[PDB]
């Protein structure tokens, strides 16, 4: 019973091997008053072989504490690179937030570990996410004054925006032209869930070219290493878009990748409902831009 909890907090690989081949029914998802499961304590202590057994014993990788911390966040806190690698190999959600609004990537940027940064953003992490204090991963990376980390993040986002321009060019045959992003393009892992939510701020410029308009794009994208490729056709995972409790409607009835986006100045709330494919390896690049109608 209790024996496995303290065993996992400490080093007892033989004990766990026997308990895992023994004829006793153990709940490997029990949470103490704090809420930590065996998976996240094991990840807290860098005891990797325990993690391999826990994964091969059917243990939720993506649990959460009462303050919203998953095992992956714990691993990121204490620089246990090998543990992060195995969790990402186990289908762990990367972009979950704590009650304070911080993600794993932010911890890795804060402590200056470039390797974790590469590993998570390559597996589809979102850089522009903000905490309750409106600091992004990028601000932490630059204040920690670790050049490799902030170069990595900056080049990653440069690549994302570049591919957005390229794909819209390809799909509208250049009769249309992007002008200025409305709000930092975000990234969503479909395997993480069917819901998507965010809060942003919109500040219009004085000079609005008459005949120009705002559109929301949901590019369906794949990350292969450092290369990202995206599409605005084919299978769509978008069912509904809600901007401030007002549904937004697609510009076309044949596709659900481009929606009309008429935000009001100041704070805005966006929430999208998606299809459920827990095994989908698809990333969604969500961005609302102004555009010119040629």
Swiss-Prot record:
Signal peptide (UniProt feature, chain positions): none
Compartments, record wording: Nucleus; Chromosome
Post-translational modification note: Phosphorylated in M (mitotic) phase. Phosphorylation by CDK1 promotes dissociation from chromatin.
ANK repeats: 34-63, 67-96, 100-129, 133-162
UniProt note: domains: The chromo domain mediates interaction with methylated 'Lys-9' of histone H3 (H3K9me), with the highest affinity for the trimethylated form (H3K9me3).
Function: Heterochromatin component that specifically recognizes and binds methylated 'Lys-9' of histone H3 (H3K9me) and promotes recruitment of proteins that mediate epigenetic repression. Mediates recruitment of the HUSH complex to H3K9me3 sites: the HUSH complex is recruited to genomic loci rich in H3K9me3 and is required to maintain transcriptional silencing by promoting recruitment of SETDB1, a histone methyltransferase that mediates further deposition of H3K9me3, as well as MORC2.
Subunit structure: Homodimer. Interacts (via chromo domain) with histone H3K9me3. Has the highest affinity for H3K9me3, and lesser affinity for H3K9me2 and H3K9me1. Component of the HUSH complex; at least composed of TASOR, PPHLN1 and MPHOSPH8. Interacts with DNMT3, EHMT1 and SETDB1. Interacts with MORC2; the interaction associateS MORC2 with the HUSH complex which recruits MORC2 to heterochromatic loci. Interacts with ZNF638; leading to recruitment of the HUSH complex to unintegrated retroviral DNA. Interacts with TASOR. Interacts with humanin.
Name of the protein described by the UniProt record: M-phase phosphoprotein 8
First-to-last residue of the parent protein present: 567 to 860 of 860
């Amino acid at each position: 019973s209790n024996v496995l909890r303290d065993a996992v907090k400490n080093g007892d690989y033989i004990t766990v091997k026997v308990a895992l081949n023994s004829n006793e029914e153990y709940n490997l998802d029990q949470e103490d008053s704090s809420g930590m499961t065996l998976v996240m304590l094991a990840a807290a202590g860098g005891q990797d072989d325990l993690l391999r057994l826990l994964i091969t014993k059917g243990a939720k990788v993506n649990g959460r504490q009462k303050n919203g911390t998953t095992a992956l966040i714990h691993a990121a806190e204490k620089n246990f690179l090998t543990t992060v690698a195995i969790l990402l190999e186990a289908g762990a959600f990367v972009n979950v937030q704590q009650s304070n609004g911080e993600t794993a990537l932010m911890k890795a940027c804060k402590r200056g570990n470039s390797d974790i940064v590469r590993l998570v953003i390559e597996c589809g992490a979102d850089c522009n996410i903000l905490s309750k204090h409106q600091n992004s991963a990028l601000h932490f990376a630059k204040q920690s004054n670790n050049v490799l980390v902030y170069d990595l993040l900056k080049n990653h986002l440069e690549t994302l925006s570049r591919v957005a321009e390229e794909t819209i060019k390809d799909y509208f045959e250049a009769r249309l032209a992007l002008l200025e992003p409305v709000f930092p393009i975000a990234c969503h892992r479909l395997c993480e869930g069917p819901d998507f939510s965010t809060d942003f701020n919109y500040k219009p410029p004085q000079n609005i070219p008459e005949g120009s308009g705002i559109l929301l794009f949901i590019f369906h994208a794949n990350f292969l290493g450092k290369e990202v490729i995206a599409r605005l056709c084919g299978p769509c995972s978008v069912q509904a878009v809600v901007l401030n409790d007002k549904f937004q409607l697609p510009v076309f009835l044949d596709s659900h990748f481009v929606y009309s986006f008429s935000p009001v100045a100041g704070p805005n709330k966006l929430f999208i409902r998606l299809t459920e494919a827990p095994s989908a390896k698809v990333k969604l690049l969500i961005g609302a831009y102004r555009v010119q109608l040629q």
